Design a protein around this nucleic acid. Sequence first.
RNA 1: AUAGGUUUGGUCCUAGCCUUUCUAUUAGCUCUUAGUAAGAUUACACAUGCAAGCAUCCCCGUUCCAGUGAGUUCACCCUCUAAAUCA
Lengths: 193, 54, 295, 53, 86, 168, 119, 77
Amino acid sequence: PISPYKDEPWKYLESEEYQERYGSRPVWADYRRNHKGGVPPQRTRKTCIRRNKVVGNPCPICRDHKLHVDFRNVKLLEQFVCAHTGIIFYAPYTGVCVKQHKRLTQAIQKARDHGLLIYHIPQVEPRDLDFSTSHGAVSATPPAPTLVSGDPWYPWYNWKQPPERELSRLRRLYQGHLQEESGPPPESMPKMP
Amino acid sequence: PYPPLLRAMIIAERQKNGDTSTEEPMLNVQRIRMEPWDYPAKQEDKGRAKGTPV
Amino acid sequence: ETKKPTFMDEEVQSILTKMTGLNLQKTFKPAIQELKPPTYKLMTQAQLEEATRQAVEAAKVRLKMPPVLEERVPINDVLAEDKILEGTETTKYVFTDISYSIPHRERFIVVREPSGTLRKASWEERDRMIQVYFPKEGRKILTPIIFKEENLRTMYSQDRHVDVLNLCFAQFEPDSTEYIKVHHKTYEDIDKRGKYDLLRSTRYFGGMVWYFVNNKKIDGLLIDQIQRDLIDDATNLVQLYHVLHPDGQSAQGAKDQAAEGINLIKVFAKTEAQKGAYIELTLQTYQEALSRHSA
Amino acid sequence: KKVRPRLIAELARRVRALREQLNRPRDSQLYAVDYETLTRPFSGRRLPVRAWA
Amino acid sequence: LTQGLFRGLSRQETHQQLADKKGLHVVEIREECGPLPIVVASPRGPLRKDPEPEDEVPDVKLDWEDVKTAQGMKRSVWSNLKRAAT
Amino acid sequence: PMKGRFPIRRTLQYLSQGNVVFKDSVKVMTVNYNTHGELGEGARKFVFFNIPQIQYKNPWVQIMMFKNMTPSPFLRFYLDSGEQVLVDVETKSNKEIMEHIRKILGKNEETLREEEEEKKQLSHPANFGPRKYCLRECICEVEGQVPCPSLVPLPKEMRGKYKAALKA
Amino acid sequence: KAYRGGHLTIRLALGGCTNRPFYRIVAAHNKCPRDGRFVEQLGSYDPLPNSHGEKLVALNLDRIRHWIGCGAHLSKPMEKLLGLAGFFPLHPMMITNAERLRRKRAREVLLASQKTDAE
Amino acid sequence: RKTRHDPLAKSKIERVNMPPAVDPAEFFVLMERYQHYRQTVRALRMEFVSEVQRKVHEARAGVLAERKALKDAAEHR
RNA sequence: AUAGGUUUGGUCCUAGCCUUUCUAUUAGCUCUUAGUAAGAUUACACAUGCAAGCAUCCCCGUUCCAGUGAGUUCACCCUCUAAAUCA
Ligand code: FES
Ligand SMILES: [K+]
Ligand SMILES: [K+]
Ligand SMILES: [K+]
Ligand SMILES: [K+]
Ligand SMILES: [Mg+2]
Ligand SMILES: [Zn+2]
C-alpha cells in the first residue's frame, strides 16, 4: 500500500479514519501477543514484515500502514512513552516488534533533541566552585628565553657537525662496515611541488 | 632549563602560592655525572658462567 | 572612588531575590520521573509550620542565582615551538592532565600541533576534554542540536524558556560565548513577548533583570509588575536602575524631586523610559483601582 | 595448616650448591676460545662478529 | 482469594479516617516534589496539640520476604519480568 | 513474620544506624548489667538494642557481657595503651549511655567524613576498565571517538585485511 | 606472584578490538603480562584521530611523578609521549627520525625535479 | 617462549647476525644526544625522589602531624 | 513468580512432579552477505617444523611471557625482614 500521509504523518492522527479505528485509546490498546504459557517471551518478534510480506498477527505499528514513526509525529510517539514517568515502554509492554521499537526509540530521542517532545530537564549544579581565570594554566605563561630568542629549547636538538678527529675514530672502529657520511639535515621539511 | 610543560607548571605554582620571581626554574645537573659507557664497571658484583660443559 | 554595584553585591542580591519571589508550588513542581510510593507523617499544626519553613529554606537554596560572568578571553599562548618535529606527525596531540585534586580551571591541557608548536588548549578544547575524562551529568561532548536557532525558536514557541536555560547551564560554562549568547537570546524573547512570569520563582530571574537594567530596557518588566500589582518590586526595579545608572536623567530627577515609592516610577517614566506614555496609563489604572479597595 | 615437610627439596639444594663449588668450571675452561672458528668450546657459542678481529 | 481480596479492600482506612481518629494532619511527602509538605487530610474536628509519641524502635512485625528484598538477598528469575500492559 | 521480639533489630538498615565508631585505642568493651531491678533498665535496653549496632560498626572490638556479677551495671573499656575507662551506667537510659560513650570514646563526625573522602579518591573517573572498577571499559564509548568495530564496521582503509591487499 | 627481581615500569597496555587499538598507561611490574596485573593506571592514549582530528592522551602527572620517584622505569613509546607533551625533553630518536625523514624527502624532491626538468 | 632446557633449532645452528652499518656523522651526534638526554632525566628523577621522601616525613613527623597528635592526646586526657 | 496444569464421584487442605522465563553445550533438519567476540571431550599418546637470544669476548636473559586445571583452605590482613628498582 501507499499511505498519503508519509509527507505529513501528523495528519493521520487528526483524520476521521483514525478516530473511528482507535478513538482516544492508544493504537496498541487492543493488541494481544499469541504465545504459549502465561509468561510471554521476554523479546518480541524481530520484524513483522519480511521481504514485503506481513506476518499473521502484525504489531500495532505494522498492522496499520498509515502510522508513520517519524520524529515529527509527536502525538504517535507520545503514546509509547509513560506520561507519569517519561520512560519509553519496553517492547513487551505494547507488543511492537524489535524493528519498530528501535525506530520508535530513535524517533523519540530525535523529537526530544529538536524540542518537539517535552521531557524533564533537571536543574544541575555548577561544575566549578571558583570561576576565576587567573591561574597560569588558562592565563599567559611568561615566554621562555629560548622561545623569545628563537633557539631550540635544548641546544642538542640542532645538528652540530662532529669534529673530523671524532669521525676518524668511528671510521677506524667500524672499518669495512661504514655508510656514506651524512651532511647536516635540511633546515626545514621539504615538500613535493 | 626545565622541559616546557614542567616549567609552566612550576611557574604557575609560584603565582598560585603568591611567589613573584622573574627567575626561570633551572634543573641542577652539577650533581649528575655522565660517565662514558666504556668506564670499567664493578667486577665484584658480576656473575659467572655455570658448570654445564659441552 | 564610587564603584557601581556588581551583580553579587549583598544589596543587589536582596533586591533581585525579592523581585524573583518564592512560589513553593512552582519551585517544587512534581517532576515527571521514576516514582516511588509516597510516605506519610501525622503532624500537628506546629510541626506542619516547621516543615513548611524547612521547605522555604530548601527552596531558597534551589533558587540561588548563578553568578553573571564576563565572556572569557580566548587563550592563545604558545609554550614552545619545536620546529624539528614539523612534518613528522599528521594529527595534533591533545594532552590532558587528569590529576584528580585539581580545580578544572587550573588544569594544564596542551596541544602539540603537526607544525611542532606546543600551545595551551583553547577554551573550547579545554571544556571538551574535561567532559571526556571528568564526565558531568547533563553535559555532552558534541554540542546538542537544540541550541541551533531553528530549534530554540520551537522551544520558545512552547513557552519552554526555563528548560532552554537549564539545558544551557548544563552544557556550557557560565563565561562561555555560547552560554552568554543563549541566555541573551532567551531574555530578548521574554521581553518581546512579555513572558516574565515564566522565570519568576526560578534562579534565572535575577540574570534576566540584570540584563534589562544594564541595557536600559526595563520598560516591559515594569509594566508587567504594575499590571500584576507588584509595585514594591517595580519601585525596587526603578531604584536599582538608578543605582546602576547614577548619572542619568531619571536618577537626577529622583534626586532633584526626592521621589519615593510610586513617584520614582513617574519620574523614570517621563525622563528615560522609552514607553513613557504606556507606563503612565498602566500606573494610572492601578492607582485608581487601589483607591477603590481602600474605601 | 601444618605444611608437610619436603625434605628432598632441601637435600638436592644443598647437594647442588656443593657440586657447584667442587666441580666449578675453571677460568681455563670457561674463557677458552677456538681461534679457527672463534667459538668458546665449553659453551659452544660463537663470539660476536665485531669481536672476531 | 476473591473473598479475601474484598475483605481487605473494604476495611482499608482512608487518610481522612486516620486524621479524624488521630486528630492530626496527614502530610504526604513525595520524592518527586522534594520537601514540599502537602497535606492530604486534616481533622474535621479539633486538632490535637500534643505530638504523637515517637517510639525510638517500632515494635512492628516485619515480613521476611520484604526485608530480604530490600537487602538484595532475593534472587528470582521470574520477578520483574517484562509483561504486556495490564 | 520475622521471628523474635523487635525483629527490626535483625535488619542491615537498623544495624547501620549506630553512631558510635570507637577510636582505634578501644580494644575490649565489657558490659556488666543486672537482669532485674529498675535502676538497671537502661543497661538492659542498651544490651538489647544497642550492642548489635555497636558491634556492627566496630567488628574488631571484643564485646563481652556479664550478668548479675555486681550490684550495679557498669561499662569498662580496655584501651591499647592499657588504660581502663570505667563508665557507670546505672540510672541512665540506653540513649544516654549510647551518647556518653560516643563523646568520650567515639570518633567525631569530622574524622569520619575525612575517611570517606579518602575512599572517594580510590576510584578515578578517568580510569578505563571493567565495570566493577571503572565507569567506562573502552575509549570507543566516548562519543566522538572512533566507535567499536563490533557496533560500527571500521572504514576499509583502516582495516588490516585491506592495508596489505592495497599494498600487495 | 613473587617475580625474581624485576622492577616497576610505566608502559602502554594495549586494549580495544581488532583494528581499533587503545592504550592504557599503567605502572606495572616489568615481568607482568602486557595486559595483566598493574599497580596503578596513570592515563590513556587513543592513537586513532577522533572526529576533531585529535589523538587524545591523558596523563595523571601527579601520580606519574610519584612512581618515577619510587624507581619506575619507562618504556620507549611512553618516553616519546611524555616528550611530545613537554613533561620530558624530546627523546633523541624522534629528533633523529625527524632528520632522517627530512633527508629522505629532500632526496625524493631531487628525483622528482629531474623527472620534470630532463623530461 | 622457549625455556633454557628446550633444544635449539637446527635451522638456526649457523645463523651469524651481521651487525648494522655505522654512519660516522649520525653516530657521534646521536651518542651526545643520549648523554645530554639522560643527564637531564636523571636530574628530574632526583627531584621526584626527594619530593616523595619529603611527603612521607611530613606525614610522619611534620609540624601539622605532630600538632594533631598532641591535640588528640590532650582531648583524650 | 502476577502464577499455571495434575490426586477425588465431588469439595477443601497439604504435598510432590511438571508447564510457561533466561542461558550454555550436543543431536536432527536447515542456512545468503558483512563486522566483531568466542572457540579439543580427556594432566591420554605424540611424526614433523618452529617458539631465546643479545652483545667487542665477561655478564645479563632463557626463573619471564605463553599453557593447563591434576592436586588443593601457600592467595587476603598484621608483624618481621631478604632479594630487587630509584646510575
Ligand atoms: S570495546 Fe572499545 S573498541 Fe571494542
Ligand atoms: K501444586
Ligand atoms: K544445531
Ligand atoms: K649480554
Ligand atoms: K584443578
Ligand atoms: Mg635490600
Ligand atoms: Zn512490527
